[PDB]
Structures are given as C-alpha cells and as structure tokens.
Amino acid sequence: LGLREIRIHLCQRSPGSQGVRDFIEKRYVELKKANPDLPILIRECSDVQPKLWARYAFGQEKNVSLNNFSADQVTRALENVLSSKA
Amino acid sequence: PTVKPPTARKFIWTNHKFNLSGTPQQYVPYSTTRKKIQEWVPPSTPYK
Amino acid sequence: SNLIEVFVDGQSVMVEPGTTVLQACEKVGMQIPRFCYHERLSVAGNCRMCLVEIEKAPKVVAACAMPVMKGWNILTNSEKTKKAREGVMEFLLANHPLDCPICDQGGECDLQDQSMMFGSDRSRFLEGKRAVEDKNIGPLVKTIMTRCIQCTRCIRFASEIAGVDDLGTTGRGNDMQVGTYIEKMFMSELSGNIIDICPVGALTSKPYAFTARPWETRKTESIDVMDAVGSNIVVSTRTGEVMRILPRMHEDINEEWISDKTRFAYDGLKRQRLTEPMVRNEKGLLTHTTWEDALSRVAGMLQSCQGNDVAAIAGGLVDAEALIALKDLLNRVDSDTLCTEEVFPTAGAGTDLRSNYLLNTTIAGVEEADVVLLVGTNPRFEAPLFNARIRKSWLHNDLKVALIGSPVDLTYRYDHLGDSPKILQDIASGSHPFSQVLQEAKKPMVVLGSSALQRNDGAAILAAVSNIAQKIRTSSGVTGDWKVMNILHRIASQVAALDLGYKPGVEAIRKNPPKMLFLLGADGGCVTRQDLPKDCFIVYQGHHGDVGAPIADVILPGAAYTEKSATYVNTEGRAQQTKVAVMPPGLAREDWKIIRALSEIAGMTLPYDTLDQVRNRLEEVSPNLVRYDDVEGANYFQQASELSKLVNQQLLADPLVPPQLTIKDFYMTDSISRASQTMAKCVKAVTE
Amino acid sequence: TQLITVDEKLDITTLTGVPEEHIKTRKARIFVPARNNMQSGVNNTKKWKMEFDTRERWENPLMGWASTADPLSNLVLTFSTKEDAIAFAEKNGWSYDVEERKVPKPKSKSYGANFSWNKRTRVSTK
Amino acid sequence: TRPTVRPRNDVAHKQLSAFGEYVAEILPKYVQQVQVSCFSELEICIHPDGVIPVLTFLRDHSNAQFKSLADLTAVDIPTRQNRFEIVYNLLSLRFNSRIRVKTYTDELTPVESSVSVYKAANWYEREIWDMFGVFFANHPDLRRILTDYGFEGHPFRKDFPLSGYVELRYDDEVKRVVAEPVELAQEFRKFDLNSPWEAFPAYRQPPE
Amino acid sequence: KVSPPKRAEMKTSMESLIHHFKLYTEGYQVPPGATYTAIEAPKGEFGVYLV
Amino acid sequence: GVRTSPTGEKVTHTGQVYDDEDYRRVRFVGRQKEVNENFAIDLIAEQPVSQVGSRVISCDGGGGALGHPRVYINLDKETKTGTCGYCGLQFRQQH
Amino acid sequence: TSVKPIFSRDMNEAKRRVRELYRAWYREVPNTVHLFQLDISVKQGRDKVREMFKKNAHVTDPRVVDLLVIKGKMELEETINVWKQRTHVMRFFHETEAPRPKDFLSKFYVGHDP
Amino acid sequence: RFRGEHALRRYPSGEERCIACKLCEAVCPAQAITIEAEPRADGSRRTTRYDIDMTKCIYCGFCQEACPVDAIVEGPNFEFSTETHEELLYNKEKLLNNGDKWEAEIAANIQADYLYR
Ligand code: SF4
Ligand code: SF4
Ligand code: SF4
Numbered sequence A: 001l002g003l004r005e006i007r008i009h010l011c012q013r014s015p016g017s018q019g020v021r022d023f024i025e026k027r028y029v030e031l032k033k034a035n036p037d038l039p040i041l042i043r044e045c046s047d048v049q050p051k052l053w054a055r056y057a058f059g060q061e062k063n064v065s066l067n068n069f070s071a072d073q074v075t076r077a078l079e080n081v082l083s084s085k086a
Numbered sequence B: 001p002t003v004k005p006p007t008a009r010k011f012i013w014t015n016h017k018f019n020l021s022g023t024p025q026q027y028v029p030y031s032t033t034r035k036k037i038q039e040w041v042p043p044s045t046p047y048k
Numbered sequence C: 001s002n003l004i005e006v007f008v009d010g011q012s013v014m015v016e017p018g019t020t021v022l023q024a025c026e027k028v029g030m031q032i033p034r035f036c037y038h039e040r041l042s043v044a045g046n047c048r049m050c051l052v053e054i055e056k057a058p059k060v061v062a063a064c065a066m067p068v069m070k071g072w073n074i075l076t077n078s079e080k081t082k083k084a085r086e087g088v089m090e091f092l093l094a095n096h097p098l099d100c101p102i103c104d105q106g107g108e109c110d111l112q113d114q115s116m117m118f119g120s121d122r123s124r125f126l127e128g129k130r131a132v133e134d135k136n137i138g139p140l141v142k143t144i145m146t147r148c149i150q151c152t153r154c155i156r157f158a159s160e161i162a163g164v165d166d167l168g169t170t171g172r173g174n175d176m177q178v179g180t181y182i183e184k185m186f187m188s189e190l191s192g193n194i195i196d197i198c199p200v201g202a203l204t205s206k207p208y209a210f211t212a213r214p215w216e217t218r219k220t221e222s223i224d225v226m227d228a229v230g231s232n233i234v235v236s237t238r239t240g241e242v243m244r245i246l247p248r249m250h251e252d253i254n255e256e257w258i259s260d261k262t263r264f265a266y267d268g269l270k271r272q273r274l275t276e277p278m279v280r281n282e283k284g285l286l287t288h289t290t291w292e293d294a295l296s297r298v299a300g301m302l303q304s305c306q307g308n309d310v311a312a313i314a315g316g317l318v319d320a321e322a323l324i325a326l327k328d329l330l331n332r333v334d335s336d337t338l339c340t341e342e343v344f345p346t347a348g349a350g351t352d353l354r355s356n357y358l359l360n361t362t363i364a365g366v367e368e369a370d371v372v373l374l375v376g377t378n379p380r381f382e383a384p385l386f387n388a389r390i391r392k393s394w395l396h397n398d399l400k401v402a403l404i405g406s407p408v409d410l411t412y413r414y415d416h417l418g419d420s421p422k423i424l425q426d427i428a429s430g431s432h433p434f435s436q437v438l439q440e441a442k443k444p445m446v447v448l449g450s451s452a453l454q455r456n457d458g459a460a461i462l463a464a465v466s467n468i469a470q471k472i473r474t475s476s477g478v479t480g481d482w483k484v485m486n487i488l489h490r491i492a493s494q495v496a497a498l499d500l501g502y503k504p505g506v507e508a509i510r511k512n513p514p515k516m517l518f519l520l521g522a523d524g525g526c527v528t529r530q531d532l533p534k535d536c537f538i539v540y541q542g543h544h545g546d547v548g549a550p551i552a553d554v555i556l557p558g559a560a561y562t563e564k565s566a567t568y569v570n571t572e573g574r575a576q577q578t579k580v581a582v583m584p585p586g587l588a589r590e591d592w593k594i595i596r597a598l599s600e601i602a603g604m605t606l607p608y609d610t611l612d613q614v615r616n617r618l619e620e621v622s623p624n625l626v627r628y629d630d631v632e633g634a635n636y637f638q639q640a641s642e643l644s645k646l647v648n649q650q651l652l653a654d655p656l657v658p659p660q661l662t663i664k665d666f667y668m669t670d671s672i673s674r675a676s677q678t679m680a681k682c683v684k685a686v687t688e
Numbered sequence D: 001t002q003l004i005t006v007d008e009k010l011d012i013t014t015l016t017g018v019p020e021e022h023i024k025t026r027k028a029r030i031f032v033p034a035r036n037n038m039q040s041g042v043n044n045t046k047k048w049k050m051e052f053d054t055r056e057r058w059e060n061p062l063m064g065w066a067s068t069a070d071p072l073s074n075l076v077l078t079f080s081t082k083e084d085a086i087a088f089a090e091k092n093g094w095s096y097d098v099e100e101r102k103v104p105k106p107k108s109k110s111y112g113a114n115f116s117w118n119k120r121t122r123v124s125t126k
Numbered sequence E: 001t002r003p004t005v006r007p008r009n010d011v012a013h014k015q016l017s018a019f020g021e022y023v024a025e026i027l028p029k030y031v032q033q034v035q036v037s038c039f040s041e042l043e044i045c046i047h048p049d050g051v052i053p054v055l056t057f058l059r060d061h062s063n064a065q066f067k068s069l070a071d072l073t074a075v076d077i078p079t080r081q082n083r084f085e086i087v088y089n090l091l092s093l094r095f096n097s098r099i100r101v102k103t104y105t106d107e108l109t110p111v112e113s114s115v116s117v118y119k120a121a122n123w124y125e126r127e128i129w130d131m132f133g134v135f136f137a138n139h140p141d142l143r144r145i146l147t148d149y150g151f152e153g154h155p156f157r158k159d160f161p162l163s164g165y166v167e168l169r170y171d172d173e174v175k176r177v178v179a180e181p182v183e184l185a186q187e188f189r190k191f192d193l194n195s196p197w198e199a200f201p202a203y204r205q206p207p208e
Numbered sequence F: 001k002v003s004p005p006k007r008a009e010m011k012t013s014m015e016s017l018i019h020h021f022k023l024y025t026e027g028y029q030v031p032p033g034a035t036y037t038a039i040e041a042p043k044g045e046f047g048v049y050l051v
Numbered sequence G: 001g002v003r004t005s006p007t008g009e010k011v012t013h014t015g016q017v018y019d020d021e022d023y024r025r026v027r028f029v030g031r032q033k034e035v036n037e038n039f040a041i042d043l044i045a046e047q048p049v050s051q052v053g054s055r056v057i058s059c060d061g062g063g064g065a066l067g068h069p070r071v072y073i074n075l076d077k078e079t080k081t082g083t084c085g086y087c088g089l090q091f092r093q094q095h
Numbered sequence H: 001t002s003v004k005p006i007f008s009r010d011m012n013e014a015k016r017r018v019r020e021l022y023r024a025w026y027r028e029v030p031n032t033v034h035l036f037q038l039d040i041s042v043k044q045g046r047d048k049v050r051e052m053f054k055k056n057a058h059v060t061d062p063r064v065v066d067l068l069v070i071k072g073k074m075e076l077e078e079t080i081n082v083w084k085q086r087t088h089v090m091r092f093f094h095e096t097e098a099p100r101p102k103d104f105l106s107k108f109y110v111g112h113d114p
Numbered sequence I: 001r002f003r004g005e006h007a008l009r010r011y012p013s014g015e016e017r018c019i020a021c022k023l024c025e026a027v028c029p030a031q032a033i034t035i036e037a038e039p040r041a042d043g044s045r046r047t048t049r050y051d052i053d054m055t056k057c058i059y060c061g062f063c064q065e066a067c068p069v070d071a072i073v074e075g076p077n078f079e080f081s082t083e084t085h086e087e088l089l090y091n092k093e094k095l096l097n098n099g100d101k102w103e104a105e106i107a108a109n110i111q112a113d114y115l116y117r
C-alpha cells in the first residue's frame, strides 16, 4: 500500500561503494528536499557490500544490489523504488 | 568429673538430650537466610 | 632513531628516552612489585618496594622513578634486590594489624600476595603495633585507617582525577594519618574508584562489606547501561546472585574507572522486580495470571487495532534486539509510530545521516583536541567518564575548555561565556574573540549535550551549533579527518533506537492518540493517561515496576541488563554486547522472546527464533549494530549542514539550564537507581 | 605409501559423546580475562580462555543451595594462542565468538612533570 | 640452603645426560628431544612412528635392559594440535635406572600397540582408550575396562565436565534403574584460586 | 610458605597469619615439571605420575 | 530471648521466619523447628565495658592461644567506645 | 593434509564396514530381544538401530566413520555375550524421560532454555 | 584428638566464635560447607548461613585446623546415626546446639590438645 522507509548501506573507503558515495555527495540533499517525510537512512560501514533495502506496508521488504554502480545507475534504481509504490 | 568438674558457662546445656532421631522432637533442616529478591506490590486502587 | 638500548638480565631491549626501569621491565614481560606506582596516576616513589639493582652501581634505585640510560644492565633477580624487597616487606608488615579473616581485601590483597611471593616467612617484630583512629568519609566507602600503609594513591586520585582536593596526610612520622582532618563527607561522582586503587583493606565497599569473598565469585563481563558512556564492566556473582560490579580495562572509554551509579546499582537491581505477568481483573486491580493468558489478551487487543491506533515507547534500558523485534512486529500491523522518551530534533537531515547524533570524533578524541566548547550540558553528572577524559586532557595536553550555560562545577577551571542561547549568534557571526579562538584552534571540538535538546528549541540550538562547526571547518586550516561537531547522549538506548529508524520524541503519540500503547520500559512518565483517550490498552514490558506499571493494563515482566545477552550502543556509535550474569526472577523472560511469542499467538510470527538470527536481522537493518568494539566514522557533515539551513527556527530567551546542578540530582536518573536503598542513603547523606 | 590425502572438514562432534543439545544451543566464548582491578598483577591475563554462557541455576526447595541443570557451567579451558583455541572451537562444533586482547597502551611517565615551572601538571601536595 | 632445601644430585645428572646423548645418537630416526630434569629424571620425546623399535631397543640392548614397564600415561593438552601425550615409563633392574618416553598423538591417528614389547601394556593402553579415545592398532583385545557399558564419550578428556551427562536412578514404573539428565542438588562451586602475581622467574615464557 | 605455621605463632606474627591464609585457601605454587616417584608399597611398586 | 511471629513458628537469631503463605512449613508439622535459645547479640549485650587507661589496648579473647589473634584498638575517640572486631568486646578510656 | 589411515584407505571401505556392521546388528537384534526377555518387538529394535545409523550419518571423514565403526563393533561384541544387563540395553529407549518442548512457544512457557 | 561430629563453639562471654571468614569452606575437600554472610545489626561480621553436609563430609579435620578462631571443631561425638537423610544436613542452628551441648568436653579436649598444634 506504499513504501515507508529507504535504507542505503555503503562503505567509507572501499571503491565498490564509491559511486554510491558519489550519489550522496551530489544528489541526496535535493532528495531530502523532495520527500521530507520519507526516512532515507544512510548507513556507513567498513567492509560491507553496497545494498539498498526498502520497507513497504505490512512489513514487506525488497532488496536491490548496488554493487559497483555508478552515480547515475544508483539514481535510476532509487527513482525506480520511490516511484514504484508496489 | 567428681574431682575435675567442667568449667561452668552461661550457655552450656543443663539437660543432656540423647539421640532423638525417630521421635517427634527430631531435627528438621531449613534455610536460615531471608528472601533474596523482593517483589513489586501492585497498588490497591483502580486506575480510573 | 632516538630510541636507546638497555639491558635486563643480560638481554637487550629497545626503549624510548624518558622511559623508567619499570616500563622496560614490563616491556620484557616481567612485573616488578609495587605499592604506590600506578600507570594512571603520578609517580610518588615512597613505598620503596620497586627497588632494583643496576649492575656496577652499589646503590639500589627505584624502578618506578628512575629514568634509564644507554648501556645500563638491570638485575631484577639478584641477591640485594631480594634483600631490599624482604626488608621493605618486613617494614610494611611491622605495624599491619592482624585483621585478615575480618577484612574484605582477603583473597585479592596485594600485600598478602607479594608477601607470599617476595617477602619472608616470619615476623621479628616483638613490640606493640600502632593503632590509628578510624574516620567516617561517607555512606559508600567503609573506612578502617588502621590497615593503611600510606601509599598515597588516595591523595593523587583526589587531587588529579577526581579533582576534589579533600584528602591529605596529617601529622609527622609514623603517626601520620591519611584523612581529611575534619568530619568531611567526601562525596563525588568518582569516589568509589578509590576502593579499586587501595592495595590493602583500609578502604572497602560499604554495601559489599562482609558479604562475599573473591575466590568464590564468578566473573562475567558486561556493559553498563545506566549511562550512555558504555562502560565495560565485570560482575562478580556468587551462586546465581549478583554480588558486586567492577570496571574493566578498556583504554578508549572508561580506562579503569566507573561512576558510583554503576558501582552501586545492583542493590536496586535486586529489589522491586517484576516476577510474574499481571492483568487487570473485573475490579481494575492488577492480579497475577499465566503467561499464555496475558499474551492471548494482548494479541486479541492487537489484532483489532490497525494503522495509527497502535504505538510504542522505548525506554532507556532496552537493547536493540527488543527494539528491532517490536519495530518489525508493529510493521506487521502497518504502524510506524515508534517513539523514544528522549527528544531529538528531526528537522532537516534528522536521523538519516549518523553525523548529527553521534560523538563523531571518539571518547578518546578529546586527547587530541585543544579547544572544547560545551553547549547546554553538565558532563560531570550526565557522563562522568567523559568529563574525566576532558579533565585528563586539560591536565596533560593543556586543553582549553569553555562552557555555555549555567556555571556548574566541572572539577577544573573553564571559561563561562554565558547562559542565553543568543551567545551562539555572537559566535556564528564573529563578535566575541572566542570565535577567533576556535578559528585559530588546530583541532577544535564542539560538544552539544542531549539535555539541551529536550527544550522546545532543540532544532534552533542544533542548527546554530552546526553553523558554528561548519563555519570553523570550512574556513580554518583543519585536516578534514578531524570531526568538529559532536553530540553527547545521556541515554543508553537512544543511539540504538536512532540507528534502527525510530522516531525520537513523543510528539507522534500526542498528535494522533493511539488506542493501544506499548511501554518498553517507559519509566520516565513522559505521557500520562490524560493525554490518551478513555480506553487504551497500555502494555508495560519491563523489569522494574516504577511509573508505567500502575497505569498499565497488562504488565509483562522482562530481563534486566545483567540477565540477558543484549546489544547496546554508547554515545559514540560503538556497538557492544552484554553477557548473561544471572537469571530473571520468577517467570520473567527475555524481551525479544516475549515479542516473538506474542507474534506467534497473534498469527504474525517473525522469521527468526534464535538470538543469532535476531542479530542477523539487526545486520540486515544496519550492520554497525553487529560489529562489536568497532567505531565507524560518520561522514557527510556538509549535506547535514545544507539540510539544516532549509528551515530556520527562532531561539528563545530561556537560559540553558541543565536538569542536573548538584550531586543530589546525580543519583536519581533511572528506574534501577529509584529502587536502590544505597542511592536513597546517598541522597539523604548529601542533603544534610 | 600408507598415507591418504584427506581434505575433509575436521569434525569429531559424533565422537565426543556430547548430546546434541549442548553442541548447538551453546555459545563458546574465547577471550583474555580482565585484570582484577583490586590487584596490580597481570599474570592471569597471559593465556586465552574458553568459557560457556551461564544457564539457569535455581534454589533448592529443601535447604537453599544453588541447584543447576547445566553440565558445562564449570568447564573453562586454557589455550596458549588464539588460533589454537579457534581450531579447538571449530573441532567440537561449538558456535563461538572471540574478543580481542586488550593490551594496555604504553603510558608516558615523568617524575619531573610534578614540579613543572608553568604547566598544569604540578602536584598540589606531596 | 642446607637444612630446608632438598639436596641436588650431580653424578646421577651426568650419567643420565650421558645416556640420553647415547640414546639420541644411537637411534637418530625417531628421537626428537632428550631432556634431563632438575631432579635427575631422563625424558626422551620421540616420534610416534617409532613407538615399537625404540622401546624394543630399550628392552633388548645390553647397556639398557629396561625390562620392567611401570606406567602408560596419557596427558591431554588441548592447546596443541596433537592433543594427546602418550608417555611410557620404563625401569631397568640390571643398571637400576628409570626412563621416560614421550610421544604425541591426536584423536584420529592411531598408534601401534606395544603388546609385543611389554605384555602389561596389553591392559594399560586399553584403559587409555576407555579414558581418552586414542585407538591402539593391532591390539589383541581392546574394549572398555573402567567405565559403564552404555557410557558415551571419554571422561578424562579436558573438555569433558566433572559430572557426567547422565545419572542413574531407580524407577518403579519400569521396575528398573534408568538414566536421566544430570540435575545436581548443589552446583559444584568453582573456586578462582590462581594468583595474579608471577611465582617463578626462571620459568618465565618469552613475550609474544 | 609450604608447611603451615603453628597456631601459637599465627596469632602473634603478621607474616604467619598471611601465610596461613594463602596456604589454606589458595595453596602453595608447585613449579612446573613432571615426575614419577615410586615407593615400595606392601603390594608392590606404587608410583604417582604428577604433572 | 526469641520472638514469636503470629503463625506460631519461632524466630531464629538470623531473622528467618517462613511467611503465612509459604508451604515449606509443612516440613515442620509433626516435628519441631530447632532454634538456638541463646542469642549472641543479647548474650554480649550484658557484658560490661572494660575501662582502661591506655590509648592503645590489645585484645586476644583470653587464654592466649585459645582465643582470636591479637588486635590493637585505638580509644582516641571519646564519642564511641573501641570495639574489638573479633570477640565483640568494647573498651573505654577513663580520660 | 596427508594422514595415516586406521583401517579404511578411502570412503568405500568405510561404507563396506558400515554395511557389515549393520548386517551383524540386524542379525543380532532378534536374539538380543529374546535373550533379555525384552518388552519391545523385533521391528521396534530394528527401527532404533536404523535411527541411530541415520542419526550418525552426516560425517564424511573416513577416519571418523572408521572410529564409529570400531565403537559400534565394540557395542555389537558386548551384546554378543551376556555382558550388559537389561538396563544397558534399555538405555537406548528414552522411556522414563519426559518429552522436552520443541516448538518456541512451549520452550518460552517452560523457561529460558533456547 | 578424635574426629567426630562437627560443632560450632562460643567465646567465654556468650558470643559466637565464627567471624564468617570462609576459610573452612575454601579448604573443605568435599565442599560440604556452605557459608552465606551479611553484616548484622551491631556491625559485627557474623554468619547468616553455615551449612555442613554430613553426608558429604569425609571427617578430615581441615576445617578445625584452618579456622583461625577455633570456631568449628570436629567434636568427640560419634553416636549420631539418623533414620532420615535430611537429618544429616546440618544448618547453623543444629551446629550451634551441638556446640552448646558438647562445649563442656570440647573445651577440655582442646585444652589438653592445643599445645601439639
Ligand atoms: S589488607 Fe591487611 S588485613 Fe586485609 S587481607 Fe591484606 S594484609 Fe590482611
Ligand atoms: S587508604 Fe589505601 S589507597 Fe589510601 S593511602 Fe592508604 S593504602 Fe593507599
Ligand atoms: S572435616 Fe574435612 S571434609 Fe569434613 S567439613 Fe571439615 S574440611 Fe570438610
């Protein structure tokens, strides 16, 4: 019936999350200026793989692998999940 | 002890008791410590 | 290379200049006996136990106070070293009283241990020993001054770390007594740590006195939850009963010290417990019942509610496992109304980035700074070990401390800027020279307490301090890896709740009134039944029945922090795990087990049944909660600064008054301390 | 040749005679024990230790002792190195967690700093 | 030094060191270490693959004549990969000497039986199996000798607890004694008695 | 340090009370080393292998 | 002198009395609860206070080797009488 | 990784020894039932033998299953002669044991044991 | 020197000899002695629970020599066979009653024997 939260995991130093970092350094703020009541939790770690977890209504959750993604591919996947509302 | 009586004390028994095992006056073990964990007493008045 | 080579027992080793003999002997893995030396206190050099012999030198030197030089050979097992050790031991045991059976230090006494290891086996003292008059220095530290050896760790601890300057050495010669010369009640936030550093039984723990013996106690390591520092502690237990709490050697947080609340919370931990589930009967009184009946009633009321009609409140002593279990259970019913007792501003970035709700540098990062600004906090009571670290940096690294708020005592000297919030507008503009002071600072630090955010202008204060921090960092010549902005939390479960996606503050509950409310240890009494409608199925899930239990409709007993393997995150974002010391009393069970069984009754069971699977779910939500003893850097300060400038609030004229001012308010913080007769005795003793 | 190349996993869980309840529901802990803070000795912090989590111990209804039902509550093992303890934990099929050795950092001590001319590290009394 | 200290022997130390050198130079295939203790006891640490020849040498040489077998002891040290230490004790009646032969063996690898050298070990190592699980190949009759028939596991291993896993009690419903999970009336109180101070400086391990 | 002192001297001297405390609670520290000492029991050779 | 809780069961010198709702009292019916009629605190409460003229007194419990180890008691504080830690006797300075 | 074998050089010889041990046990089970005047049937005892044989079936190390074959052969030899009593035979059937809870709800009700 | 039934002695002033130092429970080879202590009303360090399991005890006399105040004594009584198992599980009160019963001969025995110790 609708998404409720977005969770984006990354690493500080690894290159595989680097493009994901290139999203956060560029286009995150306008995202928080676009959906102010939608919590997009950014979680940094040390050696984890890039990932994108979305929670929907009644506990439904989907997973997207953001491994070795560039900034524009991350933007495409994230606009897909916010515009999905499955 | 008719010539070497024992030393008189204030706590030494004046009546020797034999083995009372099997009698109603036998020994029963029990814990000598009080309750360890206390319990929360619910209030005596309703929440209305 | 400036390092020099010295010799111990014919073996070469490479040490730094300025390194004493004892540090080199510890570098080669040996322990020279000592009584007055301490690795965290200044060198006194008076016990004379550490005497060793340098070869080709006919005088013994004190290994705790003699710097080494190149070419020195140290003989730690020669004849004259053993003779000196035996003589010093005989002199120490000459006037020591025969009190070993009735002394709590027995079994862990330094004097007995090194008397067996290095002393002789008989006493030649045929005279009459001395007798020292006892003293009464408080209701926590039992004092018997006859057993003291004048090691003067009391004096250095009171003058250097606690900084109270009350203890002293009165008199001359063998009649000199370690005391205060008057009936002075020595009370401080770090008093009980002197019981750690007394090598003899002169100072003992008064609640622990004549209760146990160290050889029959099992030690279980755990984490403190009373404060948000995350103190690594150990619990000594005896036959399934919690006896005493000691610190642990963790150099990054609580090096070997703890606060008095952690040291004496166990008496409250063993009183006023909840041992059996209770439900309201027809008369409205709380009456005992079975687990299945209470769970069935809660599930039956839960299945009717949907949407915003159900909400939950997280307490200050609830682990992340129960938090994620309740979050997923309330997400099974499609309810995001998850609230915490402590209020944090969600304006702008909010809880998304981890940079704006963590102590971003380190607890130990204060050792690296030179200018520290405190805004609206009293760290002497909210986080005593953080204030101890600040005092250590102020003593050794010549740190500069300035505080905004009421001029409280912080056991050192600082710069009191003021109490109105408008002073931040004087700093963010550049009117006062203190702005230039942090501009010229190489490693500046801005610390904002979480008690100031409890006011109605927390967003404005956070925006002002973030503006100050990002004005300093983007203009001054800072390295970049240095994190200026820091937020000090005073609730153990606050960081774990914020990392889990909870909504801080109770605003979402008073906005839309829920018909069924969870109280996961909501002992603060943040919302009364008046703010809620006429019929609410309030369910309390906690160990101590303090505030929410008399108003709850169903009471579910839980496990305390010593009775479950629990994940807690301190104020700096470091995850830690507690261990099981004892069992919950009666029918009380672990909290996540209760939530999972409730979902199994309700027909919305979660896909985990064991604790490691709960930790796997925690890793799925956020990995930082499952990698223990590791601190992850919280980046992206500029994005949070840009998001904080979108909406601007107005700072009010209310002075930044912390809720704690004196030592009286320090002992009354949580539900565990509210059931402690030791803390009641401390409050009574400090209020006279 | 009288030697066989076996690359199979070294598992002897079925040879020790332990019931299954105590090889899958238990958590082995490998750690260096903390120094007792009432003593300055560090001789007990040189060997790694393997321990098990404490299970339920209740009170005897007759006389009041600590009656337990866990057979491994008094089983603490000593190992010289971490990897050997890890191998012994993997060998018996126990799920295990390891805490790192918390070495004390090398402090900088100086007797002269108690009598500095202008620094804040002067001793108020001696 | 004189009244309250045990006197030291040096001629026995010299003779034991000489015989240890002689043994180590006479069987270089299997010997690994030779040590003489402070109280004049000779210990030979040899490879397991020479369990049969070396002892047989000590049984049949003119200069050894270790005819008597005193002990067959297994020591469990869990911190090694070969956690079992099989130790033979031999006594020579002609030269009046005592010797100790040590070998290492883990759980799975077998060791050849020393029945053909000393027949007393035909019982002794049998008990070793019943206490340790160390299999002895080519044993004539190897089975349990001390524990119960339905006993699972080996008790003397250091991971085995003090109290067992089962207890016996008589039930009238089945008219039989039966095994139940162990539930003690009082838990065995573990006493922490290790001193936190160093005792012997000459026994100190080098740092890591 | 090995044999406990007398009862008359443990109530007068400090060192005797300390050594009585540790011997009857902790026990004396035996140095590492394995020995096999055998005596002539009336049945035969009785030996103890102590480690 | 012992006390009497109102369930009919005697009071031990420690202070252990089974409650009215405790079933363990069924172990006492048909038998007796063995307690000590000589309370130690009451037995030492009638001992006189020894008045000495020395600042430091020495106590060994009487009989030499048949008593507790010798302990020295300071009597500087005139507010509180110096009480021996082993035997419980108390000494008072005349001055 | 090269080790000394016990009796079996590879997995096939250990499987053959497992087969032979199971054959001998299946031969013995009626005689064991008759000798001790047992209360069980023959098929119940054979079901117990199969249940042990399949419980101890998730290990693939040839030395481990070789040691288990040797221990099972000792068990078989002890049942060949009259060395065990009725108790040691009946110990495999946990009859007087109360059935422990298995699901999460009953385990939550009875205590803290996971 | 006969070793028999355990008993708890008293001072010649009415006060109990034991000071709850827990040496006897640490030296006991059979762990038959259980001690639980708390500081009582007058501040003296005294026992609250002193349990001796006579079915566990091996009558070795380590407690009577480890005791620094001669509180616990292996007394002279040997005719104390019981008809029930729990009657051999002594608490503090039974031991104190045994001491009060047999002090008139335990004092004489320890007076005759103490010069050998
Ligand atoms: S502090 Fe003194 S009385 Fe206490 S155990 Fe140590 S030596 Fe004995
Ligand atoms: S009371 Fe203890 S810590 Fe204080 S000076 Fe004396 S021995 Fe040192
Ligand atoms: S005689 Fe020995 S076994 Fe018996 S209670 Fe005393 S110390 Fe324990």
Ligand code: SF4
Binding pocket: C101, I017, I018, I019, I020, I021, I022, I023, I024, I025, I035, I066, I067, I068, I069, I070, I071, I072
């Ligand atoms: S040894 Fe003596 S004084 Fe110490 S606890 Fe035992 S009976 Fe009491």
Ligand code: FES
Binding pocket: C033, C034, C035, C036, C037, C044, C045, C046, C047, C048, C049, C050, C051, C062, C063, C064, C065
């Ligand atoms: S440790 Fe050096 S004199 Fe005390």
Ligand SMILES: [K+]
Binding pocket: C105, C194, C195, C196, C197, C198, C199, C200, C201, C202, C203, C204, D038
């Ligand atoms: K102390």
Ligand SMILES: [Zn+2]
Binding pocket: G059, G060, G061, G068, G084, G085, G086, G087, G088, G089
């Ligand atoms: Zn006295």
